[PDB]
Amino acid sequence: KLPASFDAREQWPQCPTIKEIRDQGSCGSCWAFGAVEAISDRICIHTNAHVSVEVSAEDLLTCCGSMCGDGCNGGYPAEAWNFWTRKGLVSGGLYESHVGCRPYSIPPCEHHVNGSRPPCTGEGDTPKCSKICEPGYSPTYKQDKHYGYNSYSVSNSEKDIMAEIYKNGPVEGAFSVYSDFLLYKSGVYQHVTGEMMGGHAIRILGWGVENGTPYWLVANSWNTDWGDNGFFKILRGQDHCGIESEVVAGIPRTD
Ligand SMILES: *[C@@H](C(=O)OCC)[C@H](O)C(=O)N[C@@H](CC(C)C)C(=O)NCCC(C)C
């Protein structure tokens, strides 16, 4: 039944958010970015591309509060999707994009790569929960909220995660970052060297096989000059670094 490879970007070509890589900046907001990225994709999938919006990382990061964790000091993906069912999330694009209700307020930076942006630094301050859209945005903040029908865990099962993506779209997951991951450029990542850096949440949008090695297709939130245009592949089928152990998702409510 399931194909040997699957790429959500190919399945849903009228859903540009599936292709988009974001930048969490110097803020420990991975938990929020994996969530709003996958939610953006799923709203588009759920509406057959009639609604394509960048869901606001700012709104989730700043307005969830203690139930999701501590903002830029880290958080809990399962409760991020729960917040989407309870209070909903407004739209908002990239830093200084002036797109949507609440664009991200934390500037982009260089994540373990060289570039023209400032180097990323340690976990900044969490911005305030501001329940107002940027000036001139036409829907009110309340009216711009997109809600989830539900939020749920996917079991620690390769085939279960594969089926979830195949039917319902990209998911959020999390894994343990070891130092050798930081220099990833291409290929299928397998941890071989380096100490544990901490847990990191990401968006899983497909799977495949490269040179006989099964992999998950993953979007990072470290801008496009990190990794493979902002994406990476990681070993699939052995819960490698915990990649299959903390998968979460949810189905949108119809706006
Ligand atoms: C993730 C991040 O931004 O790292 C990039 C530098 C945040 O630090 C974050 O929210 N991390 C974390 C929750 C904290 C540690 C309470 C998380 O989501 N960990 C995933 C668990 C993993 C070991 C399977």
What keywords describe this structure?
monomer, 255 residues, alpha+beta, Cathepsin B, Chain A, 6-stranded mixed sheet, two-stranded antiparallel ribbon, 8 strands, 19% helix, binds the ligand *[C@@H](C(=O)OCC)[C@H](O)C(=O)N[C@@H](CC(C)C)C(=O)NCCC(C)C, Cathepsin B
Describe this structure in words.
- By secondary structure, this protein is an alpha+beta fold.
- It has one domain: Cysteine proteinases (Cathepsin B, Chain A).
- It contains five helices and eight strands.
- The chain has helices spanning 8-11, 30-46, 57-63, 77-86, 158-168, and strands at 6-7, 152-153, 171-178, 188-189, 196-210, 213-219, 231-235, 248-249.
- Strands 1, 3, 4, 5, 6 and 7 form a six-stranded mixed sheet that branches. Strands 2-8 form a two-stranded antiparallel sheet.
- A hairpin with a 2-residue loop joins strand 5 and strand 6 (213-219).
- Helix 2 (30-46) crosses helix 3 (57-63).
- The two termini are 32 Å apart.
- Ligand E6D binds next to helix 2, strand 3 and strand 5.
- This is Cathepsin B.
- The modification N6-acetyllysine is found at residue 142.
- The active site is at 30, 200, 220.
- Disulfide bonds join 15-44, 27-72, 63-129, 64-68, 101-133, 109-120.
